[PDB]
């Protein structure tokens, strides 16, 4: 039995031995030039080849071999479309990446293999992909459901996914009528992505949508500390946690590794004020499918 919409998935269609070969359609600087680090928001062509579904993700393959000769291993990439996509046909797939780029140990720059083949391709390039991957983060089935949704970053492309579903489409079987809260933290204004189209979400479903974002580096609470994501979340502690205690609400969190700690020290204090071991109340969750968590 899944709380979760599972029924009829579609996972290793294709894979790494026997990749599907799309094309780029497009590839977007998504981030400003102030952004530490440059994000991209790319679209390949699938030709409904690839029936995923929000929340999963492709791996990609990129261009070449690795030190021995052998082609690279795969890198997995939440989709940031959802299932009909950017076009609204179901034929193309969206990605949002960042380049990555470091120095190793003698002081040399060292550029990620997949993440710079990916953000250096240009409309018509073709590219490997494989899945679709993933059972994780998959929607909620129920259409009343609260989900609250905490990304950092990339983090954001499942529920960019998530959210075009539930306010920029028509579906037969499908109406959200519950209550979807996004939370995004960036390190600057330069590094928010996709503000603009959850700032018309909001608009078209004021009553359905709430949004909240934390700029690190440009804003503070009170006390003077960094605006970090869980540094946003403690000022609705109370609201969140309360609706923490409610079976229709679903916690999904995506980003970079470290998030989860932050926010789990938030936590335990607002358990343990209660009587609650979060430890454990955070196993139970897990166990009802109500608390999803995908960091890397
Ligand atoms: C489920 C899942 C979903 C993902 N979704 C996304 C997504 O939507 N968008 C996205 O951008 N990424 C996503 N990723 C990450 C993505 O898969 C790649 O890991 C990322 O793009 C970097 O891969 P690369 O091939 O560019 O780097 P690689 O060439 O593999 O290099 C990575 C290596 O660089 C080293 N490294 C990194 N930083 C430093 C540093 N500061 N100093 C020294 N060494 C360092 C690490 O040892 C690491 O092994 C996801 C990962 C997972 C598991």
Redesign the pocket.
């Given at each position: 039995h899944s709380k979760k919409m599972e029924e009829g998935i579609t996972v290793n269609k294709f894979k790494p031995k026997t990749p599907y070969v799309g094309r780029c359609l497009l590839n977007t600087k998504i981030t400003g030039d102030d952004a530490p680090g440059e994000t991209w928001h790319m679209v390949f062509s699938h030709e409904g080849e690839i029936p995923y579904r929000e929340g999963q993700?492709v791996g990609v393959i990129?261009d070449g071999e690795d030190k021995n000769g052998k082609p690279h291993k795969l890198?997995?990439?939440?989709i940031?479309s959802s299932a009909l996509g950017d076009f609204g046909d179901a034929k193309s797939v969206s990605?949002?990446?960042?380049r990555?780029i470091?120095?190793?140990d003698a002081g040399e720059t060292?550029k990620?293999?997949?993440?710079?083949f990916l953000c250096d391709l240009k409309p018509g390039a073709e590219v490997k992909l494989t899945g679709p991957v993933g059972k994780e983060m998959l929607m909620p089935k129920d259409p009343n459901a609260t989900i609250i949704m905490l990304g950092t970053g990339?983090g954001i492309?499942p529920f960019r996914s998530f959210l075009w579903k539930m306010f920029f489409e028509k579906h037969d079987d499908y109406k959200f009528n519950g209550l979807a809260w996004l939370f995004l933290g960036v390190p600057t204004s330069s590094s928010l992505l996709y503000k603009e189209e959850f700032e018309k979400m909001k608009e078209k479903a004021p009553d359905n949508f709430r949004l909240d974002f934390a700029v690190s580096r440009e804003q503070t609470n009170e006390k003077g500390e960094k605006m970090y994501i869980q540094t946003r979340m403690a000022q609705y502690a109370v609201e969140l946690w309360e609706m923490l205690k409610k079976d229709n609400t679903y916690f999904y969190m995506c980003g970079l590794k470290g998030m989860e700690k932050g926010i789990d020290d938030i936590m335990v204090s607002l358990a343990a004020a209660e009587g609650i071991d979060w430890i454990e109340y955070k196993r139970q969750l897990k166990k009802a499918e109500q608390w999803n968590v995908?960091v890397?």
């Open positions: 993700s990129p890198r997995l990439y939440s940031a990605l949002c990446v960042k990555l470091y120095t190793n060292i990620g293999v997949c993440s710079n990339t492309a995908q890397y």
